[PDB]
Structure formats: C-alpha cells, structure tokens
Amino acid sequence: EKYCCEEASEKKCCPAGCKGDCKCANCHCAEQKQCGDKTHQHQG
C-alpha cells in the first residue's frame, strides 16, 4: 500500500507508492520486485 519506505513518502524515491518500475534503493525495487535474496532487512 503506497510507499513503504521511511523517506520516500512523496517523491524521494518513487512517485508515491512504487508504481512498479520505481527502481527504489532502500527497498530494492525493480519493476515490481520482491528482492530479499538471502532474507534482507525488508520489513513488510
């Protein structure tokens, strides 16, 4: 639901809620990705 980062709550990283191809850096997003290779710190 909308942004899930503690900084990208507007356009710091994505235009409000990673649409998909946001290419986040804190959550490691990529065209709607889940990331977390070896259990990352991703808390969602």
Ligand SMILES: [Zn+2]
């Ligand atoms: Zn996000």
Ligand SMILES: [Zn+2]
């Ligand atoms: Zn993202």
Ligand SMILES: [Zn+2]
């Ligand atoms: Zn994300």
Ligand SMILES: [Zn+2]
């Ligand atoms: Zn990651």
